[PDB]
Every structure is written in structure tokens, then in C-alpha cells.
Design a protein around this ligand. Structure first.
Ligand SMILES: [Cl-]
Length: 129
């Protein structure tokens, strides 16, 4: 599924991401935009042979099992294919574990390079939330 900006903001707000560990909704929408272009079906292969999955590009090296990342952890205890669903529940619940692991949203390279220190509330402007 390819989300609209406000559609995704509303879905993330309903799943409890607005101000989760102090990150306003704008931060999550901005990260999703640059990670996946709001496409739940986004996959990208890393140099290490790991693969990034879904709207928040969650990595198979640490977070999910794709059956092809040797020696990897499955710290969200899900198949990576669960992260490609039109329902963002699995992506959001895993993201909550990631952002809680000590480095906050710095875990998302596109958030650090394209969202951090910007006016992120611009991403939820005009939305009915
Ligand atoms: Cl933090």
C-alpha cells in the first residue's frame, strides 16, 4: 500500500507513535517518507547481505527473520514479510522496540540525514488527526 501523508500520520497516531519516547508524529512521517516513500512494500538490500523491509525499512540483520540473513537476530520475533503488510501494526510495534534500544531515531539513517534538526511538524500540517 502507498500511504498519503495525512493517512499515514493518522494511522501512526492511532498506533501510539505521536510523542513515543519524545518523538513527535512529524518525525515518524518524515522518516517513512525518506525510508520508503510511504510504500509498505519497499525492500532494499544492504552491502552486508541483510535486507530492509517496509515503510520504516526495518533491517533483517537485527529485527526480523527473512530466512536468508545468516547469524542475524530476530529481536521483533516476526518474519520480515509481516513488515510489508498494508496494516502497519507489525512495523509500528517493531519500530517502538528499535527507538527504545538507546540511540532513539538515529537508528534510521534517512531520519538522521534528512529529518533531524528540520521543521518536522511540516509533515503533519493540514492533516485532521
Ligand atoms: Cl532519544
Amino acid at each position: 500500500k502507498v500511504f498519503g501523508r495525512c493517512e499515514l500520520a493518522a494511522a501512526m497516531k492511532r498506533h501510539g507513535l505521536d510523542n513515543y519516547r519524545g518523538y513527535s508524529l512529524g518525525n515518524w512521517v518524515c522518516a517513512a517518507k525518506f525510508e520508503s516513500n510511504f510504500n509498505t512494500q519497499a525492500t532494499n538490500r544492504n552491502t552486508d547481505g541483510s535486507t530492509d523491509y517496509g515503510i520504516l525499512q526495518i533491517n533483517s540483520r537485527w529485527w526480523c527473520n527473512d530466512g536468508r540473513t545468516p547469524g542475524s537476530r530476530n529481536l521483533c520475533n516476526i518474519p520480515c514479510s509481516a513488515l510489508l503488510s498494508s496494516d502497519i501494526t507489525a512495523s509500528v510495534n517493531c519500530a517502538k522496540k528499535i527507538v527504545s534500544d538507546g540511540n532513539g531515531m538515529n537508528a534510521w539513517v534517512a531520519w538522521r540525514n534528512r529529518c533531524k534538526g528540520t521543521d518536522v511538524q511540516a509533515w503533519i500540517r493540514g492533516c485532521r488527526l
